[PDB]
Amino acid sequence: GLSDGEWQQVLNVWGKVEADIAGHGQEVLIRLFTGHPETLEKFDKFKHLKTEAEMKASEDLKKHGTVVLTALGGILKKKGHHEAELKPLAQSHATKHKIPIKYLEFISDAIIHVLHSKHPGDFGADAQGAMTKALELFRNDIAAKYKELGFQ
Numbered sequence: 554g555l556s557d558g559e560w561q562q563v564l565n566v567w568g569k570v571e572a573d574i575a576g577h578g579q580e581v582l583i584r585l586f587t588g589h590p591e592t593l594e595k596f597d598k599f600k601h602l603k604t605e606a607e608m609k610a611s612e613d614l615k616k617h618g619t620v621v622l623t624a625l626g627g628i629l630k631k632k633g634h635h636e637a638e639l640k641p642l643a644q645s646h647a648t649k650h651k652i653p654i655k656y657l658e659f660i661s662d663a664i665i666h667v668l669h670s671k672h673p674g675d676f677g678a679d680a681q682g683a684m685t686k687a688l689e690l691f692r693n694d695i696a697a698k699y700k701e702l703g704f705q
């Protein structure tokens with residue numbers, strides 16, 4: 554649960570992402586894969602990537618970063634009223650992709666890391682607080698659907 558002022562911060566931060574969605578999405582995925590190499594094994598289409606240079610050169614990885622962040626941005630713009638948008642993603646990630654909730658924690662922290670890396674000094678303490686709460690709400694509502702499905 555976020556206040557109006559916290560949502561305002563979230564959507565202000567998101568404007569930074571929307572200026573370069575593919576560059577942000579690429580770096581989020583690279584931070585996830587290099588920091589937590591077990592996550593790469595969930596992607597049949599990226600498991601061939603052995604080095605970060607290959608990851609950086611992959612146009613399909615940048616494409617997938619755009620897909621991921623476009624979906625997250627659509628959820629964030631709902632300011633918590635995201636049941637219809639979140640349900641299909643929870644279902645596909647539990648039943649088809651088999652993504653443990655832990656990996657959603659990993660990517661949440663990676664988003665925070667990339668924002669500081671690309672906007673040093675321009676991602677203030679209030680903005681980090683609000684973004685973190687929004688990603689926690691997203692993860693918690695996914696977790697509720699995972700529990701319904703019995704997925705661990």
Ligand code: HEM
Nearest residue numbers: 592595596598620621624625641642645650652656657660
């Ligand atoms: C911010 C969190 C994330 C968002 C918004 C997101 C969004 C999406 C979307 C929109 C798709 C395509 C449609 C679908 O299959 O449902 C997708 C595919 C996928 N997601 Fe996620 N995702 C997230 C986190 C992750 C994480 C943490 C992993 C694994 C570590 C992951 C693994 C996958 C895989 C394996 C696919 C299928 C890729 C393919 O072969 O084309 N997702 N995701």
